[PDB]
Swiss-Prot record:
Changing residue 410 to A: Slight ceramidase activity. Changing residue 459 to A: Slight ceramidase activity. It comes from Pseudomonas aeruginosa (strain ATCC 15692 / DSM 22644 / CIP 104116 / JCM 14847 / LMG 12228 / 1C / PRS 101 / PAO1). The active site is at 249 (nucleophile). This is Neutral ceramidase.
Length: 643
């Protein structure tokens, strides 16, 4: 028989496509205005031979998975699958894409630029994650797990080199880059690649703060290219996860010119391509088969004044400071949007309802505990609720000789490396040979910098919430969890994660009413395609539509490129959907309450020469009935010429 069983599942988690602040850039003005490609939850269920011990890892095309999401999906999994799933064996991570709708956190600080909690996006996310896990378990099949690694030196650059070089122990990271990519491949009973999870550090910020189209960014393109363009086996699921990318940017030049590009879409595709290429090469090598038990540990840790043993600090006992954000340099900002929550409370009704950024003075105890940080906002002391998390999840999965760490924050290269070495040192005797550090997991508590980097207070340091010893605390938490795994004892009793579902505000307007263009009806074609197009041309079409906020069209689409044959009379077969890289769905307000759906298609090489037409699906809400109806239209047919 085989050592393991695995199940690969995928579900739509795309949020509100129009008029909701995007998550990542903290830009008040960056609201969704369409979709380039959808966001997906990719679940990997791993079962272990004799026992049916189960582990679930889900990587999401999101900026991060906030505590609110974690708490909700687990509550559903625990209630619906009692005894099989709980916080011990469910890990949720994010690719950290900055092109998705926000508002799915329960902490004000992360909802600031979005003007609050966006329930519709939040629920689409928890439901999609749960759905991906149900689909993955439903596809449990026997197989083998392989682990391998390689180096990728051309897909990232350190955005805070000055701080990075402050670390004495950077042997192997002299240029600021963590070139290591790890790949856990899943091979079915026929020795065929069923899926894979690739781990490699680099912000998914190829799409800038000027973009308004939803997008999985570079990691999402890598996933897509493998699933849609490369793999011929279906049910194929490829996830591209993060490790320690706190100070790693994909824009190789310094903002929106990665390698030599000048273009964010080209940059997104190329960076995704390079990550895909490396992962594909590594997976093909099937370097080291994974074998051994499956195990896990989870613990909610209250960070408030958490005791840090002298061996992780400078030789003296320390206690974590309550959360605070300090100022730092940019100029505009940098790795893309506006910065250190300098969202000006003027156009922010949500910010003023909270009481402004600053309120009174941070206690003198907080000021010195925070050391070199010059506090801009004391988020930990905010009332009635702190704007940042205080109880955080620490989780480790043992998968054979592999240990997967789920860390609730963005860790700089060295912040993660140190934790990795420390955990690897503690797990050696247990048979662990590879420690995979997965940041952006289970919750989001900003940045983690090493004591040294923190002292320089560059962007990541300013956002290292709990003080100079935040990195040390995390290293102490993961080491203690690792020793527990090694000794087979429970980890300490979990603290309680605050449930904030009760007090969420929202100042972002929903859909009031939709109206067709004057004299038109929803679904009407405002712009018909040209008579014919050649391969490589971009077909642009437009429709009278309704606000996409009315319906996410989860597991569905706002458009379809349909092929009706060489003579135009064959059974219509759809060749492109709103998820595809080749298509784009854009929404724009026209008049007072009307709106336009602009759909574009870049005919890709390999397109069957023939007749095609574009179909649009939308939803419109009526003011009088408050009813949301389905709407749509289809353009006339155009011809695709062999080229
Ligand atoms: C100073 C830093 C200014 C902007 C960047 O730090 C932000 C953009 O909002 N980007 C990320 C990835 O965090
Ligand atoms: Mg698309
Ligand atoms: Zn980041």
């Amino acid at each position: 028989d085989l050592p393991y069983r695995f199940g690969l599942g995928k579900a739509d988690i795309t949020g509100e496509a129009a008029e909701v602040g995007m998550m990542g850039y903290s830009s008040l003005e960056q609201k969704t205005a369409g979709i380039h490609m959808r966001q997906w939850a990719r679940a990997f269920v791993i079962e272990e031979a004799a026992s049916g011990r189960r582990l679930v890892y889900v990587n999401t095309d999101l900026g991060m998975i906030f505590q609110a999401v974690h708490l909700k999906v687990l509550a559903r999994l625990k209630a619906k699958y009692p005894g099989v799933y709980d916080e011990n064996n469910v890990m949720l991570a994010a690719t950290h894409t900055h092109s998705g709708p926000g508002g799915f956190s329960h902490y004000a600080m992360y909802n600031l630029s979005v003007l609050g909690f966006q329930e519709k996006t939040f629920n689409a996310i928890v439901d999609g994650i749960v759905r991906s896990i149900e689909r993955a378990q439903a596809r449990l099949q026997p197989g083998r797990l392989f682990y391998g690694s390689g180096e990728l030196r051309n897909a990232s650059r350190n955005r805070s080199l000055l701080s990075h070089l402050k670390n004495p122990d950077i042997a192997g990271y002299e240029d600021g880059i963590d070139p290591q990519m790890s790949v856990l491949s899943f091979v079915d009973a026929n020795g065929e690649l069923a899926g894979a999870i690739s781990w490699f550090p680099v912000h998914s910020t190829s799409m800038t703060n000027a973009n308004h189209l939803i997008s999985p960014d570079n990691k999402g393109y890598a996933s897509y290219h493998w699933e849609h363009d490369v793999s011929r086996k279906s049910g194929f699921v490829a996830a591209f996860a993060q490790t320690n990318a706190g100070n790693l940017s994909p824009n190789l030049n310094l903002k929106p010119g990665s390698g030599p590009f000048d273009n964010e879409f080209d940059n997104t595709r190329e960076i995704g391509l390079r990550q895909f290429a490396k992962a594909y090469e590594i997976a093909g090598q099937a370097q080291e088969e994974v074998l051994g038990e499956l195990d896990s540990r989870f613990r909610f840790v209250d960070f408030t004044r958490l005791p840090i043993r002298p061996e992780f600090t400078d030789g003296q006992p320390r206690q974590l400071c309550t959360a605070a954000i300090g100022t730092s340099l940019a100029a505009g900002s940098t790795e893309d949007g506006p910065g250190p929550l300098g969202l000006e409370e003027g156009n922010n009704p949500f910010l003023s309802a909270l009481g402004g950024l600053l309120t009174g003075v941070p206690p003198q105890e907080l000021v010195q505990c925070q050391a070199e940080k010059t506090i801009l906002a004391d988020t930990g002391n905010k009332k009635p609720y702190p704007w940042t998390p205080t109880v955080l999840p620490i989780q480790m999965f043992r998968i054979g000789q592999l240990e997967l760490l789920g860390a609730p924050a963005e860790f700089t290269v060295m912040a993660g490396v140190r934790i990795r070495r420390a955990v690897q040192a503690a797990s050696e005797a247990a048979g662990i040979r590879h420690v995979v550090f997965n940041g952006y997991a289970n919750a989001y508590a900003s940045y983690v910098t090493t004591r040294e980097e923190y002292a320089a207070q560059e962007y990541e340091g300013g956002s290292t919430l709990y003080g100079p010893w935040t990195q040390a605390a995390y290293q102490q938490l993961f080491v203690d969890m690792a020793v527990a795994l090694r000794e087979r004892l429970p980890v300490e009793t979990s603290a309680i994660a605050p449930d904030l579902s009760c007090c969420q505000m929202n100042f972002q307007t929903g859909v009031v009413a939709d109206d067709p263009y004057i004299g038109k009806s929803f679904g009407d074609v405002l712009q018909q395609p040209r008579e014919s197009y050649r391969i490589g041309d971009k077909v642009t079409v437009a429709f009278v539509t309704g606000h996409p906020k009315n319906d996410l069209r989860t597991e569905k689409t706002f458009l379809e490129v349909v092929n009706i044959g060489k003579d135009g009379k064959q059974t219509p077969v759809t060749v492109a959907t709103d998820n595809d890289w080749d298509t784009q769905y854009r929404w724009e307000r026209v008049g007072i309450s009307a709106s336009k759906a602009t759909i574009s298609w870049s005919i890709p090489p390999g397109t069957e020469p023939g007749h095609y037409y574009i179909r649009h699906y939308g939803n419109a809400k009526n003011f009088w009935t408050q009813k949301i109806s389905e709407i749509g239209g289809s353009t006339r047919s155009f011809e695709v010429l062999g080229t």
